[PDB]
Design a protein around this nucleic acid. Structure first.
Ligand SMILES: Nc1ncnc2c1ncn2[C@@H]1O[C@H](COP(=O)(O)OP(=O)(O)O)[C@@H](O)[C@H]1O
Ligand SMILES: Nc1ncnc2c1ncn2[C@@H]1O[C@H](COP(=O)(O)OP(=O)(O)O)[C@@H](O)[C@H]1O
Ligand code: BEF
Ligand code: BEF
Ligand SMILES: [Mg+2]
Ligand SMILES: [Mg+2]
Ligand SMILES: [Mn+2]
Ligand SMILES: [Mn+2]
Lengths: 479, 487, 487, 479
DNA sequence: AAAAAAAAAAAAAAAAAAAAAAAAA
DNA sequence: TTTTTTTTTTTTTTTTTTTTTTTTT
């Protein structure tokens, strides 16, 4: 470290108010932000670079906004002077506000460690005047909101220029934008990154972007190929998986850092990796990133079980397989809890309630058990008593009625109607559209039986007529 | 596949009459958001979509109230015209249109449907065939790739009919019957029962006539036997007269002849002139009709059992989807899962005056299967109906991405709203990977819109608000002007 | 001045069987906000209040599902009890405790209303006398000062049985004949109709009875005439020829005598013994019954007209209130006001199979009186039903100021919700002088509660939520954690 | 006259920010009046701004209203001008419930020119687990000193805010908008105390700021005059949008009561028709002098109360076209009030063009109100409230008599056939009153058998006309 | 353009059930 | 105290009328 080291405590996706109403999950994101601010203060970083999503809710509640403002007043404010200057015109980068200057450039506030930040997809400008929570913070004089897009047609990313000694930074900001729109602008070359004209090649070009990185949709993701080649690093933000280690791009030769969220917002198998915040050190045109673990975030452990992939203790038929799968999941959850207990040693700040998830795929024909009676076991032992277990998986009426009529004609005794005679009338009704097929068949059989009975001169006796019609039905069906 | 593109609502409900007031709404992908004040014609757009797709008016109303009221418009008649532009399953553009008129005939309002037009673009030529309602419905069904019952209940469910999965047994059975495309067989069941009932009434009538005729048969046989007896006595008197050869016996014979001729006249009376054959034939008819009635009872029972077995077999597959959706999107700890259970009636018969239908959805609290209908919460009922509709869309409709939720978060609480928004986001993400999916959402809450728009972001919504002339205006606004309408 | 005070729920819906989960809720004044997740017991509390006040179970459910299910409780029988402590119009403390037992047997559960208690202080008497259901109901109605219909519809309206003003003609007619206490006269109307229809079916039977009696009368008269002619011939021949032909005469005498005796024995058969008298009597009965049917039809028509006139006479004042309430509450210039209009059918007869009722709520859009039912939005329907209930509460409920609004802001946009909050605040302010108003809003909207809390402040609200074993515990929370439950 | 011993306090109350912020006509109306209040404070060189609560209309202010409030407070309340008074009281009690108990201008990182001492109103009362309000957000941002908030529901102890400028000592008592029922209980129970200064309690102005109801028909829900602290010298009183800003003593209270009133017409009651003003209190040791200042940016409000019963010359009850006369009279009243607004407008140039005009009609003698939807369509573009222009407000029938009248009228109109006259009316009366399931089929039975019997005994031939002729003759013998 | 015949639904009606009241024991 | 019998209410399936649709004239 020297007069030219640009120590920047890069953080990203510090959601605030995530499960604030939750009794056990509340007051956890605020603790993580407090730890982040403590790290920045202890390390004497020049400023904090937030990648967006500083607030989970688009309109943060009173509690979250108040806690964030209290933490900012406690840490970001101080008597320490700022060792770097801004060479870009602040009337453009922060020109949206009625005070278009950086917070420490204002004489009414004594800012020690400023906080440059962009806006994520959770807190983006919405409203008639296009306000965001970061805009409220900037109006209060705590956070320098930069990189906001000011147009819906063309995005001209004007950088904010920083100078500490001989080290120069061209900080580019791009707030989160609807992903399809940003992709359609990238393919149509409607986005241009303005560069400082003086000393063009000596600026350490830094880019902060809040966009999808992995395979999410056809247009709902920003491939790295569309970013300009002149960038040197690109913090990424929208991805909550922790990838603090910069990665080399074999196609364009610019580094990529993915700080990842501080808190586990989603139960995907990407948040299981421990969350770290970066500590960027920049000298001239050389970047060195040192990660610092977060000890105030509850561990997230999840495992994937495919019952169809275990044809050894989970037989598809297995009349007593519900107990087997329930016991297997019980042992899995218990092992996860033991692992959480054994890793919690040496850490007095990590909350004593791990996040436990268990995705089960019964694609083989198994049936899920009660998630509602297999969580009562871990009501007070996990931080998510409800989402402990997730269950997911990856004939014609004519034939049925024909077979039912076939069974009926052979199971019961027909008095007058011929064997296999209605069933072919119902098929005529439903297939040939003849709306009087049943009536016509019934009347035909009635008339035939009446004519036969008249011809044979039966007596007016119930038993005699019954026997006669039975014998007629049993003899005339042959031909 | 099968994505709707444009609409032109004119003269329907509060929409204006003249061409100047004809409104155009373009449906976005994957999420179209409709907001506005109470009234103003937000649901009317879904009603027009359903009417142009299927030809069915909103439940509880007919064409008299669907069209703009001529009394309100101060005109002798009102002509409405809905036009829908959409791509069919293959991808060709079609511009179906339907027209109706509601003339003011004295106090009442007469309604009539004009011939619609089908516009299939082909090699740069826009044909226009003035087809009738039947061809229009057939072409709409063949183009959208889904059945009429699906369009009515799963896709374009009315706001007042949105809780149809939790209706009575008869209504629920009929809904899942037309949905399962097995309504012809229940029409056959209905005509079987009607034929047995008419035959039973005819059998009852024959039996009173039988009372009257048996009396006629007995009278005819008694007088025939008495005639034979008198003829025998006449022969005996003649033999006695021959033995004497007696004038008193001659007078006896004359009186016997008078008796014989008078009773032969009596036999000639049409009351019992041919009662021997008539009574026998009518008894034969009664017996054969009652035997056919018994056979009709047996066949009606067999067909009823077959139809419910088919219903249960078809429901077995979608029950798993319903269970998975309920487990994923129900935040409460009340019900483990829900499913639809259909139970056939073992004692059913065509002679029953009133039937018993056991079609129901069940809340399985713990291990006991309860009856969800009646004892469920209002929000629980709303969520259950929404889950049933989503599962029905997942199963049957794979060639019609549209689904259209008229205020889905009606009685849902905070966490249920959040879970429903998460589920809808997952549905959008899963179904839009390969084929087009549209999720028209009329709504009045802005915490649901935010949760929905966090993923698969919406950029333009539609504000549907009335104007000075009290028509309905469909205007397009950017997301920046969204909070002025929703609460 | 009836004021509910506290009430305990045990074994009802999901509230626990043992006497340890007996949740107690103390109703505040003038605002008692109930919040909680989906399920819980929010509407169950109003159901219990209505059951205690009137004895009527929630719609769509009999007593079988109201009680805690024995299968879910894993018990053979479940004993439920609700104890309400309140003050009557004279400001004296009364406590009524109803009981019920599900006692499920075999597969089908049962129900039985145990004897209630009318515990009431009389110089410290606290007499817990046991009363039957009828005595309990009559005592509650007398003490609260409001009829059963008002308590069932206006005060404690079930969530499912809301928008009952926007119901069919017959349903609305029989809800405003029980609110207007005219049920006895319409029960007499139905008795008149049933009597007329019974006499018409007797007359229809008498048609064929008269036909057959006429046939018998013709036969009997023919045989009598032929008897008299034969007797005249016999005597004339006797006295002509008695004064060879002499014995031929005697033979003719014996022939005529046998003819006479056989004819007379044919006469003594019951079908002809005296058929003139039977035919006359049956004709007399038929004509008398037909004239009585005419008179019954006239009387039924005039009594129906009188009942409809009385309904209009009350409805004019209720509509005078409804118009003001709607014009003050509805935030939209498309319906000028609403009212409830009824008129008797012109061609009404006691013999009609279907009688069409014309009781409806009419929207006055512009200058025409359209009918609200079938052409109103969900929001307008909700607002109109709430306004009609509020109007009926001002007119009929002046000795009971309880009014339970179960999720009033359903399908209501922002402006209408603010206007409804303002109207409710004004109602509370105006009806809280010299009386004790009590609102029981049960909502899931944070904004509505926050508007209702600026005036007529809430110090404590009741949050209903489940516990570990799904029992719907009722917990009383001060106003420092309201946002934990509202959306 | 101002000197080193003259506290220049700008007294504002019920600003109600964010009122109808989504209305096109009256959206930015409140942030214009707030801007004028702050400009008046700045151009008067006031020591500090005292607020009587209800600064925010919504309990949870939206992003736009909060952002505009922060913008105006940063623009005006913040500056390099030093403060001229000191707080000689422990700030950990009055400015409690915050992690920065010191006053906003005593912070070393804040440059506050005109401090704002504000209490919380009923609209923005503290709600939540931590009991925070929008005033707490403004205090944490470092703009407004939220004071006078109640501690516990058991008892309230109003800790004073002791500030002085030279020889002028003023104790700033403050009370939040506690629900008015609790305050009546807490006054009759004497569970209230105002801690006097620890020493020299003679030289203190004892300025008390309260935001509660006042004299109204709600006797249970208001705090009456006196019934308070007796040694106060000025009780600013908010929650009363009617402007009575002139401090007027009562018959025997010995303390002046000021009612600054709101800065925006929130409700359309006749009380708010008066002009809105601003305080500009001046205190010199113990002397009070408040100079009201008109608020030009406040929208005009015109209310006229008319009743149709007191104008019988023109409004004749039972008239074919009285509704047209009423509509014409209301139209003339609206036109005269709009013209009055136009005339009053030209005296200045800051009032919004569209005035708030509304009249209430009290038809009680029997009148059909005109279509208020057609009276007010003639005024879409000339009134700020196009919907609330006209307000309409106001202030035996036995079934037995009706059914008897209808029965007798029907009997007199159409003659009967067999039924005796007036019999079935009493029959149905007995059925209803005596609630027995008889007297209808029994009256029919009785009458049928009497008539049938007679018709036989009289030996009547079985034909059509004669039987009904004789039954009519038998019926007529009843009278 | 007209007649009349039929298909559809919705709203009133009726069957069936299930509990309460009674009325015998 | 139990049992059986009839009464009354309600949920929900059924029927009726009317209006639009379809076919012929
Ligand atoms: N036949 C009709 N003629 C005129 N106006 C009608 C007619 N039917 C309904 N309306 C009105 O048109 C509007 C339709 O409301 P709707 O679209 O259902 O509301 P929402 O969009 O809030 O769900 C309402 O104002 C309704 O009163
Ligand atoms: N007979 C019953 N036995 C057990 N639980 C029941 C029974 N009937 C209803 N429930 C459950 O009890 C609760 C009653 O819901 P309700 O109080 O109406 O809900 P809400 O308060 O949300 O309007 C629901 O969770 C419902 O599923
Ligand atoms: F379903 Be609950 F009544 F909101
Ligand atoms: F009642 Be509307 F559909 F908002
Ligand atoms: Mg709607
Ligand atoms: Mg409810
Ligand atoms: Mn994030
Ligand atoms: Mn106030």
């Amino acid at each position: 470290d020297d007069e030219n080291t640009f120590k920047i405590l890069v953080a990203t996706d510090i959601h605030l108010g995530f499960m604030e109403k939750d009794a056990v999950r509340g007051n956890d994101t605020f603790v993580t932000l407090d730890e982040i601010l403590r790290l920045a203060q202890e390390n004497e970083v020049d400023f904090i670079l937030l990648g967006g999503d500083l607030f989970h809710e688009n309109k943060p509640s009173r509690k979250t906004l108040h806690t964030c403002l209290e933490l900012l007043r406690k840490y970001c404010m101080g008597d320490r002077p700022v060792q770097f200057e801004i060479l870009s015109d602040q009337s453009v980068n922060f020109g949206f506000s009625k005070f278009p200057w950086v917070n420490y450039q204002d004489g009414n506030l004594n800012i020690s460690i400023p906080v440059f930040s962009i806006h994520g997809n959770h807190d983006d400008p919405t409203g008639a005047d296009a306000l965001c929570a970061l805009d409220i913070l900037s109006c209060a004089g705590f956070v320098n909101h930069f990189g906001r897009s000011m147009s819906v047609e063309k995005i001209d990313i004007s950088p904010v220029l920083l100078q500490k000694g001989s080290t120069k930074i061209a900080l580019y900001g791009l707030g989160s934008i609807p992903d399809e729109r940003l992709y359609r602008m990238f393919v149509n070359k409607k986005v241009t990154m303005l560069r400082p004209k003086e000393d063009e090649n000596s600026w350490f070009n830094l880019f902060v972007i809040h966009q999808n990185r992995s395979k999410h949709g056809s247009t709902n993701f920003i491939p790295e190929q569309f970013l300009d080649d002149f960038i040197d690093l690109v913090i990424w933000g929208h991805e909550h998986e922790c990838k603090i280690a910069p990665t080399k791009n074999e196609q364009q030769l610019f580094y990529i850092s993915q700080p990842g969220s501080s808190v586990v917002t989603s139960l995907s198998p990407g948040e299981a990796v421990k969350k770290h915040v970066g500590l960027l050190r920049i000298k001239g045109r050389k970047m060195n990133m040192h990660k610092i673990p977060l000890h105030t975030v509850r561990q997230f452990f999840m495992e994937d079980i495919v019952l169809a992939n275990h044809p050894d203790i989970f037989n598809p038929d297995n009349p007593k397989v519900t107990q087997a799968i329930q016991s297997f999941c019980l042992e899995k959850i218990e092992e996860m809890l033991e692992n959480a207990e054994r890793e919690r040693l040496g850490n007095s700040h990590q909350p004593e309630k791990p996040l436990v998830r268990l995705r089960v795929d019964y694609s083989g024909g198994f049936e899920p058990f009660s998630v509602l009676r297999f969580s009562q076991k871990f009501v007070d032992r996990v931080a998510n008593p409800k989402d402990i277990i997730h269950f997911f998986r990856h004939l014609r009426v004519e034939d049925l009625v024909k077979q039912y009529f076939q069974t009926a004609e052979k199971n019961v005794q027909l008095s007058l109607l011929t064997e296999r005679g209605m069933g072919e009338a119902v098929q005529e009704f439903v297939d040939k559209e003849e709306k009087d097929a049943i009536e016509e068949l019934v009347k035909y059989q009635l008339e035939k039986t009446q004519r036969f009975l008249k011809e044979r001169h039966i007596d007016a006796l119930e038993d005699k007529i019954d026997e006669e019609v039975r014998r007629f039905r049993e003899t005339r069906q042959k031909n | 596949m099968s994505r709707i593109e444009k609409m032109s609502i004119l003269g329907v409900r509060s929409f204006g009459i003249e061409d100047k007031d004809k409104q155009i709404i373009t449906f976005f992908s994957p999420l179209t958001i409709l907001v506005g004040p109470n009234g103003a014609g937000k649901t009317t757009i879904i009603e027009c979509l359903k009417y142009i797709c299927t030809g069915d008016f909103p439940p509880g109303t007919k064409g008299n109230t669907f069209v703009h009221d001529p009394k309100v418009a101060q005109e002798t008649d009102v002509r409405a015209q809905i036009r829908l532009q959409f791509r069919d399953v293959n991808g060709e553009l079609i511009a179906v249109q339907r027209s109706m008129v509601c003339t003011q005939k004295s106090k009442k309002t007469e309604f009539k449907t004009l011939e619609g037009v089908i516009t299939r673009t082909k090699h740069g030529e826009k044909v226009s065939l003035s087809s009738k309602c039947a061809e229009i419905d057939r072409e709409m069904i063949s183009s959208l790739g889904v059945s009429k019952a699906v369009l009515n209940n799963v896709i374009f469910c009315h706001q007042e009919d949105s809780n149809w999965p939790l209706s009575e047994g008869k209504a629920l059975k009929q809904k899942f019957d037309e949905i399962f495309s097995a309504t012809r067989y229940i029409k056959a069941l209905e005509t079987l029962r009607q034929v047995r009932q008419t035959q039973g009434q005819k059998v009852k009538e024959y039996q009173m006539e039988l009372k009257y005729l048996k009396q006629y048969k007995e009278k005819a046989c008694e007088i025939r036997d008495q005639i034979t007896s008198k003829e025998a006595q006449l022969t005996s008197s003649k033999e006695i007269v021959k033995s004497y050869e007696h004038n008193l016996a001659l007078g006896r014979q004359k009186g016997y002849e008078e008796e014989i001729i008078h009773f032969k006249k009596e036999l000639r009376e049409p009351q019992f002139r041919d009662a021997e054959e008539k009574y026998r034939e009518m008894m034969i008819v009664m017996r054969t009709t009652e035997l056919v009635n018994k056979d009709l009872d047996i066949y009606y029972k067999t067909l009823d059992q077959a139809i419910m077995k088919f219903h249960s077999m078809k429901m077995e597959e979608i029950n798993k989807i319903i269970r998975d959706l309920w487990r994923s999107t129900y935040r409460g700890q009340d019900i483990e899962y829900i499913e639809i259970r259909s139970d056939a009636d073992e004692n059913v018969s065509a002679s029953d005056k009133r039937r018993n239908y056991n079609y129901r959805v069940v809340m399985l609290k713990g291990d006991t299967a309860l009856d969800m209908r009646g004892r469920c919460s209002a929000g629980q009922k709303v969520l259950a109906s929404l889950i049933i509709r989503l599962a029905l869309a997942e199963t049957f409709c794979l060639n019609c991405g549209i689904i259209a939720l008229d205020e889905p978060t009606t009685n849902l609480d905070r966490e249920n709203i959040e879970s429903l928004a998460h589920a809808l986001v997952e549905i959008i993400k899963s179904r839009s990977q390969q084929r087009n999916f549209q999720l028209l959402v009329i709504t009045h809450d802005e915490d649901f819109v935010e949760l929905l728009g966090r993923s698969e972001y919406v950029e333009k919504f539609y504000r549907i608000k009335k104007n000075i002339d009290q028509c309905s205006e469909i205007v397009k606004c950017s997301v920046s002007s969204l909070g002025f309408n929703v609460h």
